[PDB]
RNA sequence: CCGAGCCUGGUGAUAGCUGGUUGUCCAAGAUAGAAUCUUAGUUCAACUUUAAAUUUGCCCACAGAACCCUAAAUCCCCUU
RNA sequence: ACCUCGGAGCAGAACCCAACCUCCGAGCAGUACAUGCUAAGACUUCACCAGUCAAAGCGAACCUCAAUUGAUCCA
């Protein structure tokens, strides 16, 4: 997806997935479940909480957007007042 | 050695006796012949070989995965979010044991980055470095560490051993010169004066608990007493030791180095240091 | 050597001496402390209760009768904490619990009282 | 890199220990790195090759 | 146009709200509900309509 | 050679469609389906391939898997 | 003529299974307003999107029906 630009000849990230997803440095990507802001009146309480909770992504669609993004978005970022600091790293992972 | 005594008997090395490590440069495989030549690994018939496949992330008219997911405030203003690089007092204990940074003198981000303790990328919007509680044990530094951010355990551990902690904010172009001043000294311009913190970090750098350089010195004994009262350790009054003056060496705002000040132009080839000596220029650099 | 308009002496003239920035209960020397690990570092504090002069008389026995579980055979109150990996933070909430104990001293149970009432209404018996 | 200070107490904190002098007479020897550390390192490959190397 | 969806507002001024269905002909309703902020059953009055169903 | 002329230029227009794609030798290898202004195609699944980490995989033995409305079988399963 | 969803046979017995194959239906309604918040562990309409069940805890009392419906941006 736009492998080489015209003014510099570099990959170009689309700001779509920036607004939709978020990266952890281990290589994981999360997202807000769709349909969480529409027709909440008819949904049971168990459904709307399932929509409010975050969800990870499969390796394929994660790999797909990883091909899209550039190395700038993959670097380690040390934010302040960031709850994702505990999750950028991984612990007790075997195979 | 067993390596060299072979070469003396073996013949002389030249271009003809030259060869790389086997397994490094694998041979190129071009599509010419019976094996690859027929279709060259592009499929039988379709966009795969014709080259008119859709873009990446296309589902054949179906809504791609990246549009069906709603937008949320994950990374907005990330080019202005607050960032700082970690620094562990384990490493500080490690680096002083190696002797690259001397505890006899006041430690600083300049002495740190001159020691290559941690890299820093000011154009990647990191306004300094924070202390990290990991390393509370095995710490006898006694240094007058200069930092930007600081944790409560790091301050207590440093003050227990007799050291000194203090926060000091730097601007983007005021920090890149701090972490790397010599190329600006190849320019010849006067070093710029620092600024006050932004319109949200002032409560932090004015508070006494976090050792704010705007906070009063009268409140630091109170904060020291509460930390000793908190984590249960004696409070060593550092006025006794001979180097108490060194430990209290601190830079006022709008000054980078303890020696140098804004407006002071420095030169290395035919080494000289110069002043403006104009009332209009001098009184602003103090401001 | 250099003093800006935002300098310490200029901002707050009340404090001038650099020594002013470094001027000056629960005696640590009287207490006994040890450390171990089990992945968190545990801090074990121990001290004789009745010998502590810094605690007053009515507070001392109050802690004894209310915290009968933790006292040792030799008379020392034992206290432990292994929430964090940092022995300093372990020592922190240890004395905080002790501070919370003396303050309140100076100030399933539903099922338990049922059986006590059942036991009391069962023992109507004269010699 | 400056030669580190000769600490009166060993092993130094942070698990540092300089090499013994004179070395032990052996058929081999392992030198320290630029930072006077041990040249033992880790490495991950294929997501599962969980190995350690010496240089 | 049988039923109607209506919102209600916390009379305490906290701003907690939700929605429920109502008949087009039935009069205004006032019911209790557990406010997570006030943390007990409190009366809410419904104000207006949002959409028919 | 006018359902709208001819020449150059944009233009190497684009074409999910056809046409064809160059030396030698060896191994493995056709595989449920869902969605699509989608059924001549594409994305994912499944299958196949390479280089690896770990250990179970396969065949399966008694027992076990519905009332409603009498089939060959099937699922699981320690042993071997 | 149909384009989505649910039930029955084809598909008898773990699962799945199509035909412009054979039938019946749905795009609601009713009662509460804790139809509140969180949380172990799993299934999943053969991918994904979705859709599902829920121990326990805080806080309280002392949901039925089968489909009964609709993503993103934007307002
Ligand atoms: Mg084809
Ligand atoms: Mg062809
Ligand atoms: Mg095309
Ligand atoms: Mg490597
Ligand atoms: Mg003509
Ligand atoms: Mg072409
Ligand atoms: Mg073969
Ligand atoms: Mg088996
Ligand atoms: Mg599935
Ligand atoms: Mg429960």
UniProtKB/Swiss-Prot annotation, chain A:
Keyword DNA-binding in annotation: no
One GO term (biological process): mitochondrial translation
Domain of life of the organism encoding this protein: Eukaryota
Keyword Signal: no
Subcellular locations according to the entry: Mitochondrion
GO-annotated molecular function: structural constituent of ribosome
Oligomeric and partner information: Component of the mitochondrial large ribosomal subunit (mt-LSU). Mature mammalian 55S mitochondrial ribosomes consist of a small (28S) and a large (39S) subunit. The 28S small subunit contains a 12S ribosomal RNA (12S mt-rRNA) and 30 different proteins. The 39S large subunit contains a 16S rRNA (16S mt-rRNA), a copy of mitochondrial valine transfer RNA (mt-tRNA(Val)), which plays an integral structural role, and 52 different proteins.
Membership in a protein family: Belongs to the bacterial ribosomal protein bL35 family.
Protein name per Swiss-Prot or TrEMBL: Large ribosomal subunit protein bL35m
Organism: Homo sapiens (Human)
Swiss-Prot record, chain B:
Biased composition (Basic residues): 27-43
GO molecular function: RNA binding; structural constituent of ribosome
Superkingdom per UniProt: Eukaryota
Subcellular location: Mitochondrion
Single GO biological process annotation from the record: mitochondrial translation
Keyword annotations of the record: Mitochondrion, Ribonucleoprotein, Ribosomal protein, Transit peptide
GO CC terms, sorted: mitochondrial inner membrane; mitochondrial large ribosomal subunit; mitochondrion
Stretches for region Disordered: 13-57
Entries under InterPro entries matching the protein: Ribosomal_uL15, Ribosomal_uL15/eL18, Ribosomal_uL15/eL18_sf, Ribosomal_uL15_bac-type
Entry-linked PANTHER family: 50S RIBOSOMAL PROTEIN L15, LARGE RIBOSOMAL SUBUNIT PROTEIN UL15M
Subunit and partners: Component of the mitochondrial large ribosomal subunit (mt-LSU). Mature mammalian 55S mitochondrial ribosomes consist of a small (28S) and a large (39S) subunit. The 28S small subunit contains a 12S ribosomal RNA (12S mt-rRNA) and 30 different proteins. The 39S large subunit contains a 16S rRNA (16S mt-rRNA), a copy of mitochondrial valine transfer RNA (mt-tRNA(Val)), which plays an integral structural role, and 52 different proteins.
HAMAP family: Ribosomal_uL15
Family from the record: Belongs to the universal ribosomal protein uL15 family.
Protein name: Large ribosomal subunit protein uL15m
Organism: Homo sapiens
From Swiss-Prot, chain C:
Disulfide feature: none
Tissue distribution of the protein: Down-regulated during the in vitro differentiation of HT29-D4 colon carcinoma cells.
Primary location class: mitochondrion
Post-translational modification, as annotated: Methylation of glutamine in the GGQ triplet by HEMK1.
UniProt catalytic activity: an N-acyl-L-alpha-aminoacyl-tRNA + H2O = an N-acyl-L-amino acid + a tRNA + H(+)
Alphabetic keyword roster: Hydrolase, Methylation, Mitochondrion, Protein biosynthesis, Ribonucleoprotein, Ribosomal protein, Transit peptide
Location in the cell: Mitochondrion
GO CC list: mitochondrial inner membrane; mitochondrial large ribosomal subunit; mitochondrial matrix; mitochondrion; nucleoplasm; plasma membrane
Example GO molecular function: peptidyl-tRNA hydrolase activity
Class of this enzyme: hydrolase
Gene Ontology biological process terms, A to Z: mitochondrial translation; mitochondrial translational termination; rescue of stalled ribosome
Signal peptide: none
Entry EC no(s): 3.1.1.29
UniProt family annotation: Belongs to the prokaryotic/mitochondrial release factor family. Mitochondrion-specific ribosomal protein mL62 subfamily.
Assembly description: Component of the mitochondrial large ribosomal subunit (mt-LSU). Mature mammalian 55S mitochondrial ribosomes consist of a small (28S) and a large (39S) subunit. The 28S small subunit contains a 12S ribosomal RNA (12S mt-rRNA) and 30 different proteins. The 39S large subunit contains a 16S rRNA (16S mt-rRNA), a copy of mitochondrial valine transfer RNA (mt-tRNA(Val)), which plays an integral structural role, and 52 different proteins.
Descriptive protein name: Large ribosomal subunit protein mL62
UniProtKB/Swiss-Prot annotation, chain E:
One GO cellular component term: mitochondrial large ribosomal subunit
Annotated keywords: Mitochondrion, Ribonucleoprotein, Ribosomal protein, Transit peptide
The keyword Cell division is annotated on this UniProt entry: no
Keyword Ribonucleoprotein: yes
Tree of life domain: Eukaryota
Any single biological process term in GO: mitochondrial translation
Protein name: Large ribosomal subunit protein bL33m
Protein species of origin: Homo sapiens
First-to-last residue of the parent protein present: 13 to 65 of 65
